[PDB]
Amino acid sequence: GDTSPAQLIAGYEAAAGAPADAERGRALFLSTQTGGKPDTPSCTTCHGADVTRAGQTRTGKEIAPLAPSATPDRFTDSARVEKWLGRNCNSVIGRDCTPGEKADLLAWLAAQ
Numbered sequence: 317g318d319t320s321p322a323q324l325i326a327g328y329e330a331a332a333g334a335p336a337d338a339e340r341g342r343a344l345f346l347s348t349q350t351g352g353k354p355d356t357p358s359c360t361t362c363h364g365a366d367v368t369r370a371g372q373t374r375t376g377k378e379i380a381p382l383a384p385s386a387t388p389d390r391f392t393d394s395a396r397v398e399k400w401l402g403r404n405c406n407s408v409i410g411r412d413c414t415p416g417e418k419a420d421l422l423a424w425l426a427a428q
């Protein structure tokens with residue numbers, strides 16, 4: 317694509333002022349949130365708790381696995397990551413994800 321997962325994570329770490337922490341990324345992705353849309357309390361509502369399996373939209377359509385081990389071009393287009401993170405953080409959390417959250421989330425997801 318136009319980027320690598322490491323290049324994306326390093327740009328988020330620079331904006332955040334801190335290195336990514338995949339354990340925090342895992343905890344945020346599995347969390348149940350209350351500030352966003354009622355029908356999407358968690359990242360897992362659509363992607364599932366195991367991101368090597370397929371997920372499902374709110375209507376039951378299949379979502380390719382988020383893990384790069386299952387779907388190889390994941391996180392290789394910088395615009396695409398920002399587009400989905402913008403929409404999906406707002407639906408789940410109710411706000412944009414910060415650059416520190418984005419680094420943590422992608423550091424966890426990039427290793428799956």
Ligand code: HEC
Nearest residue numbers: 356358359361362380390391392396397400404405408421
């Ligand atoms: C359903 C309403 C979703 C919820 C809740 C979350 N995501 Fe998701 N995400 C969804 C779709 C339909 C898609 C696009 C289809 C595809 O196969 O890519 C995505 C995509 C992403 C991406 C982009 C991956 C890439 O190819 O670079 C990321 C980084 C992502 N989703 C992460 C993510 C997080 C962190 C979420 C909780 C805040 C989350 N998603 C929720 C559908 C839905």
